[PDB]
């Protein structure tokens, strides 16, 4: 009865932890449904795991995500990655490894970032200019 896994997903400073347990096909992010997360321009990014894997692969689990940190777009990329990694880890630990291989191949073939985190972070500003690489305007004469 303890069939549950907690897996995370990070995009820049955002970090979404998806909890996946045995259940009947429910996905909710911060208590809200998956089709009500605010940047509704990028709704298909959130729907991409469920649209690649179908519904029957999700119809035996209860997924509940909790996202914290980062901005809006970084939060939904974290949500994406956490949902995919959570389903992959649940499949690996609780049904079989062939099924994990099949769904991991589908997701990785579509987009690597559903299971591998993007390692880019902001650079440090330096004391010559407004940002990391730019410099203040230099004047002659």
């Amino acid at each position: 009865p303890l069939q549950s896994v907690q897996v995370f997903g990070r995009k820049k400073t955002a970090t979404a932890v998806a909890h996946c347990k045995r259940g009947n096909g429910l996905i909710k992010v911060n208590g809200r449904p998956l089709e009500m997360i605010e940047p509704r321009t990028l709704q298909y990014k959130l729907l991409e795991p469920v649209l690649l894997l179908g519904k029957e692969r999700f119809a035996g689990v209860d997924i509940r995500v909790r996202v914290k940190g980062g901005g809006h777009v970084a939060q939904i990329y974290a949500i994406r990655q956490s949902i995919s990694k959570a389903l992959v880890a649940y499949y690996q630990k609780y049904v079989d490894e062939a099924s994990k291989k099949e769904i991991k191949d589908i997701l990785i073939q579509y987009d690597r970032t559903l299971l591998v985190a993007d390692p880019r972070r902001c650079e440090s500003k330096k004391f010559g200019g407004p940002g990391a690489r730019a410099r203040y305007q230099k004047s002659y004469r």
Partner: protein, 313 residues
């Protein structure tokens, strides 16, 4: 007429295959330890598409897994790793129960007793230490131990004189008396580091091999030296055979099977020719395992494969 054939491979690894283990209770399941930090429990679906399928992975350690062994009942596995720990896996759940944490440096090999009451390990910190099935380090031998690493430590499945055979990188094979954990016989023959040591199923013989490319047979009743056989390259693993009077060895990229009655090579299993450009060495066989019926040879390799050699008649 009794040569072997290549019956298929077992893909699904992401590193060298450092050790393979079987059990007489479940003839449809083998364990393979690797350098992708995971152990794979296989299911032998002997069909045309694939000989085997990865059934369940075990993902405990944080470095390469360097040994693995299945208990007598075929329910609990025991693994050692380069992170310096041992783990006692429960196969049904796929999760670990006990974690042995005494060893400072990388644990090269692990072994089980015949009755699985006490276990032993060996490591790169030049110590051989016993444990029990509960998790506490019982006795760590330090007097007259190996001057270099220990690379293979095994028990001896035989009632009379229960002993612990070991070998390491100081070119020495030491026979330990298990009742008092004292040294009993020291073998000095080898002229290169020893990568493996094995004991015969009938508890009469022992074998040893390594860098020098030669395999030496030592009697375990009187500590003598019967003879010595010569393999082409570095002996990465040795493995006796239960049913037949054969000794198999993984010499470089090929596998030599020495008979032990006429002392001739019955077969020299070679992999097929790939990478036809003569610019790179073939993958080297790293581990050997025999099924309980003795009709199947599982061979680990360096191209992340596990090949299955089936004996014919």
């Amino acid at each position: 007429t009794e040569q072997m054939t290549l019956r298929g491979t077992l893909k699904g690894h992401n590193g060298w295959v450092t050790q393979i283990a079987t059990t007489p209770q479940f003839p449809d399941m083998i364990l393979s330890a690797s350098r992708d930090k995971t152990i794979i429990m296989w299911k032998l679906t002997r069909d045309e598409t694939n000989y085997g399928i990865p059934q369940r992975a075990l993902r405990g350690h944080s470095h390469f897994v360097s040994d693995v062994v299945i208990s007598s009942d075929g329910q609990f596995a025991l693994s050692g790793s380069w992170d310096g720990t041992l783990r006692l896996w429960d196969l049904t759940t796929g999760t670990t129960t006990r974690r042995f944490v005494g060893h400072t440096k990388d644990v090269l090999s692990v072994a089980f007793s015949s009755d699985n009451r006490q276990i032993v390990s060996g490591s790169r910190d030049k110590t051989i230490k016993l444990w029990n099935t509960l998790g506490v380090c019982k006795y760590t031998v330090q007097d007259e131990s190996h001057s270099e690493w220990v690379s293979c430590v095994r028990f001896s499945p035989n009632s009379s004189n229960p002993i612990i055979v070991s070998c390491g990188w100081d070119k020495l094979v030491k026979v330990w008396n298990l009742a008092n954990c004292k040294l009993k016989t020291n073998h000095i023959g080898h002229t290169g580091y020893l990568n493996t040591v094995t004991v015969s199923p009938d508890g009469s013989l022992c074998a040893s091999g390594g860098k020098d490319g030669q395999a030496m047979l030592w009697d375990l009743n009187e500590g003598k030296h019967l003879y010595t056989l010569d393999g082409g390259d570095i002996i990465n693993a040795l493995c006796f055979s239960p049913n037949r009077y054969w000794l198999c060895a993984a010499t470089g990229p090929s596998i030599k099977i020495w008979d032990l009655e006429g002392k001739i090579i019955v077969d020299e299993l070679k992999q097929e020719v790939i990478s036809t450009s003569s610019k790179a060495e073939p993958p080297q066989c790293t581990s050997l395992a025999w099924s309980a019926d003795g009709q199947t040879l599982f061979a680990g390799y360096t191209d992340n494969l596990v090949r299955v050699w089936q004996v014919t008649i």
